[PDB]
């Protein structure tokens, strides 16, 4: 479950990294950063796609990727960190 | 369900696209982009409504549209992509 | 329920409107706009508090107000718009 | 529960405050502010990490910290403010 969500999240971010570095001309690290803050809804106060292709892709990217990213964040906290933390709580 | 949420989401975005292009003078694609990043809470680091009418509308738009947009994103991931993905998981 | 959440949300936004217009010197409408986009997590790409008092207040404001605002948005969509929409669905 | 989530949230914010003030050179209050708006997804329309180290850390920080911060916000509203409010509702 967590493994699959992990892989799915990685593939989604790779796609965004490739798209923004190609179409919007961002350095790969910047394309990855933008992809991450966009899908987690944090957003960036500096960059917004400048091309119409970038704007359309971003719209579709958000709708398709938000659900996945938060499902992963969910399991990552309830199925990976909760126990690890809740474990020590045990005297 | 997904069909209705889809239509409802589309109508909400059309309303925002018309409003921002008219009152804030944005190009239609930019008005649609702003509407999408606003209702998904991603936000935009470049544009913020410049008119008081735009500010008031945006406030009301957020409160009324956020619930709908995320309900659609929810079903879109749990009722449309989960199975499609979870399907292959089956050897 | 919805009435109480409505009132509670209104009071929270009034407090933010008063604070930002006073300490950060924003026009009341701008203070209200900032309060709304902050608590809904949309954010603003133009304004960020400039004073340390404003930064500290915003931090506390977010933690205390986010829960309330989304609880209201929740009921507003499930207890006020869902039925109104789901009603017509009935032939 | 709320106590543990409180402590965990505090430690996470301390780590972000130390990181951004050191690597990105922000004043401690600004580093804390950025950490808070990033993990709550509000975001900042003015600052974005300028270093690659800052960008990578932020990506990891978001994925690991978002789950915790919202779990705390959740309990803080349902286990700390709901009753306090719901109490008076009682004639
Ligand atoms: Cs945001
Ligand atoms: Na958000
Ligand atoms: Na934002």
Residues A35, B44: Cα–Cα separation, whole Å: 14
Distance CA D8, CA D14 (A): 10
Cα–Cα distance list, C67 to A23, A35, B25, D5, D44 (Å): 38, 26, 34, 15, 20
Residue B91: count of CB within 10 angstroms of its CB: 3
Q: Give A-chain residues touching B40 at CB under 8 angstroms.
A: 41, 62-63, 66
The tokens describing D23, both together, are 């690597």
Contact between residue D89 and residue C4 where contact means Cβ atoms under 8 Å apart: yes
**D43–A40 C-beta distance less than 8 A:** no
B18-45: string of b/e by CB count within 10 Å (b at 16+)?
ebbbeebebeeebbbbbbbbbbbbbbbb
Q: Does D1 touch chain A (CB under 8 A)?
A: no
Q: Which two tokens stand for residue A73?
A: 């964040």
Please tell me the distance from the alpha carbon of residue D10 to that of residue D31, in angstroms, as a whole number. 14
Query: Entry resolution in angstroms?
Result: 1.8
Closest CB to A63 among B33, B47, B73 = B73
In D, which residues are within 8 Å of A16 by CB distance?
A: none
- Residue D9: CB atoms within 10 A of its CB come to 21
| Cα B22 to ligand 3 centre (Å) | 24
Do residues C9 and C69 make contact, with C-beta atoms less than 8 angstroms apart?
yes
B64 CB within 8 Å of a chain C CB: yes
C54, burial (CB in 10 Å: exposed 0-12, middle 13-18, buried 19+): buried
Q: Which two tokens stand for residue A11?
A: 């593939």
CB contact under 8 A, A38 and B36: no
Q: Measured between CB atoms, does D8 come within 8 Å of chain A?
A: yes
Alpha-carbon gap, residue A29 to A35, rounded angstroms: 10
Six token digits for residue D7: 């402590």
Spatial distance between the Cα atoms of C73 and C12, rounded to a whole number of angstroms: 14
Tokens of D9: 């949230």
Q: Which residues of D touch C59 (CB under 8 A)?
A: 32-33, 36
Q: Supply the DSSP symbol for B89.
A: T
| CB neighbours of residue C40 within 10 Å | 22
Is the sign of the CA dihedral A24, A30, A36, A37 positive or negative? Answer: negative
What 3-state DSSP class applies to D45? coil
- How buried is residue C88: exposed, middle or buried, by Cβ count under 10 Å (0-12/13-18/19+)? exposed
Cβ-contact B26, B20 below 8 angstroms: yes
* CA–CA distance, B31 with B18 (Å, rounded to integer): 7
Say how many residues make up chain B: 91
Q: Which chains touch C (3 or more CB pairs under 8 A)?
A: A, B, D
CB contact under 8 A, C41 and D40: yes
Across the interface, whether the CB atoms of B67 and C89 are under 8 A apart is answered: no
Locus of tokens 């329309």:
D45
- Report residue A29 as tokens: 């690290």
Mark residue B49 as left, alpha or beta (left: phi above 0; alpha: psi -120 to 50; beta: remaining).
beta
Closest CA to A55 of B44, C45, B14: B44
D37, two tokens: 């708006």
Element spanning C5, H or E = helix C2-23
Query: Which domains does chain A carry?
Result: 1-91 (1.10.287.70)
CA atoms within 13 A on the CB side of C14: 6
Closest by CA to C37, choosing from B53, A37, B43, is B43
Confirm or reject contact between C45 and chain B (CB < 8 A).
yes
CB contact under 8 A, C48 and D44: yes
- Which sign does the torsion angle of CA D59, A33, C42, A59 carry? negative
* Cα B22 to ligand 2 centroid, rounded to whole Å: 27
DSSP one-letter code for C45: S
Q: What is the 3-state secondary structure (H, E, C) of chain A?
A: CHHHHHHHHHHHHHHHHHHHHHHCCCCHHHHHHHHHHHHCCCCCCCCCCCCHHHHHHHHHHHHHHHHHHHHHHHHHHHHHHHHHHHHHCCC
């Amino acid at each position: 479950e967590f493994q699959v969500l992990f892989v799915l999240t990685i593939l989604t971010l790779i796609s965004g990294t490739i798209f923004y570095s190609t179409v919007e001309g961002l350095r790969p690290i910047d394309a990855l950063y933008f992809s991450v803050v966009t899908l987690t809804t944090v957003g960036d106060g500096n960059f917004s796609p400048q091309t119409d292709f970038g704007k359309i892709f971003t719209i579709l990217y958000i709708f398709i990727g938000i659900g996945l990213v938060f499902g992963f964040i969910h399991k990552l906290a309830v199925n990976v960190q909760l126990p690890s933390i809740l474990s020590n709580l045990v005297p």
